[PDB]
Design a protein around this ligand. Structure first.
Ligand SMILES: O=C(O)[C@@H](Cc1ccccc1)Oc1ccc(-c2ccccc2)cc1
Lengths: 270, 270
């Protein structure tokens, strides 16, 4: 019954709203300078970065950065905190997925270890547009150009994600769609190490069904959106990979720079 | 109209059969399957290979192992020769795909240049099982053991494809399913350098629809099989990347040789 599938969509959509403070709807509402209720402060250079500390909630350094944690390291450390944040959010979204907490405890850890980054870059797209990305729950907006002008290594950490976002956002999905897609990503089953795969695949087939109906119902005039979204999973993979291999480089040119335990745990080479 | 999709499906199946000598149906009957009336020559050891590359129908180098050439090199170069043949076979099939020959010639070349490796490992799985792979038009069988026993660089070369095949073959697709899937792969759209993506994606959409109806009719009890197959496109991509990787590492082994100027020429990088 497609009725049980619509119900599962509803359930997932509901938990998505409850687990993630900044949805795509709010984000787009902020990105389109129409809704002038509360606009973001823009960062496109050092000075504005300086001013941003005063206009937004920046606990980082405001003045000079060269001889005191340069701008690049600062932005990276702050971007790191938000990442560990997204995990607790995603980790909380996950438990709401029917059957996920009933699975083997170990596999739960593996599904989260391998799905967290893919989900972070999927949701990160909701906060991007060809020109930049929202920061601090939408109070700010950092320029794609500014981020790309950072020190040699930190300069291209974000470029491949903007490239994903522009094409992924062309699909025009909304939160109710993203909620089912995020659930499909977690319940993979082809993750390295899973002890029991069948119980995970039975759940994902279920999710895949819900996503299929949801897309045809919500995007009737979009031929093959279902297939087109799934192929986006290949793009997410490559992003995680380049990110990881970029970290190994930094980890060697910035012996004084520290990574967070959680994130450091999740990451694994090869 | 579902009358078109079934037509395109049969048409692709027809070209597929005429373009590829060894089909999955045949290969399967030769493998684990019984259908014993002409069993293959199992190469399980160094002597099995030596005392076999002289009685099997191969075209490259004769078996010689005594301070002259390396067994690992000949096997590698052997797979390169066959793959070169494969590429011609795939190129012919592509031209039989409705709309392909009408695309900008530059994009046709581009699509083939990047789709060929993905297609090769897909069909490669048709000849594999968890224990080995069929060789030489199906006249031989090189075990998974003998391959992972090879030199340091050449020992972890085939292991990943075996792993992909084990999971890919679980899908139990058949030649009629594969014919369409292979087309979908060719008519990608996100390949770098394309000049006119619209027509390419238009064709892939029609191909996707055909694949979807095919799986629904051919595998009624295989739920969400369409989605699962599309997911495998991530596995293939990673397989292709990882491969070009070890390949570069191989280049840091054998190089300067004034005897390969014209033979080496034949094997550019794909
Ligand atoms: O405040 C936010 O949510 C910003 C990140 C940020 C946070 C504080 C200061 C500067 C930037 O948006 C993000 C940008 C990039 C990332 C991110 C996460 C993982 C890997 C790469 C980038 C996460 C959030």
């Amino acid at each position: 019954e497609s009725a049980d599938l619509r119900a599962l969509a509803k359930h997932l959509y509901d938990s998505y709203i409850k687990s993630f403070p900044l949805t795509k709807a709010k984000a787009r509402a902020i990105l389109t300078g129409k809704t002038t209720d509360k606009s973001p402060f823009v960062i496109y250079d050092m000075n504005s970065l300086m001013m941003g500390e005063d206009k937004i909630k920046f606990k980082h350094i405001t003045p000079l950065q060269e001889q005191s944690k340069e701008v690049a390291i600062r932005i990276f450390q702050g971007c790191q905190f938000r990442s560990v944040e997204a995990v607790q959010e995603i980790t909380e979204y996950a438990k709401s997925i029917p059957g996920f907490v009933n699975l083997d405890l170990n596999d739960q850890v593996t599904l989260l270890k391998y799905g967290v980054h893919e989900i972070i870059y999927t949701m990160l797209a909701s906060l991007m547009n060809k020109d930049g990305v929202l920061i601090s729950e939408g109070q700010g907006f950092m320029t794609r150009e500014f981020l790309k002008s950072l020190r040699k290594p930190f300069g291209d950490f974000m470029e491949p994600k903007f490239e994903f976002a522009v094409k992924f956002n062309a699909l025009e999905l909304d939160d109710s769609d993203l909620a089912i897609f995020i659930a499909v990503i977690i319940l993979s089953g082809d993750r390295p190490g899973l002890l029991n795969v069948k119980p995970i695949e039975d759940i994902q087939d279920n999710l895949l069904q819900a996503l299929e109906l949801q897309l045809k119902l919500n995007h009737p005039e979009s031929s093959q959106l279902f297939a087109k979204l799934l192929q986006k999973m290949t793009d997410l993979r490559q992003i995680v990979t380049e990110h990881v291999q970029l970290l190994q480089v930094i980890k060697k040119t910035e012996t004084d720079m520290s990574l967070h335990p959680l994130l450091q745990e999740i990451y694994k080479d090869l």
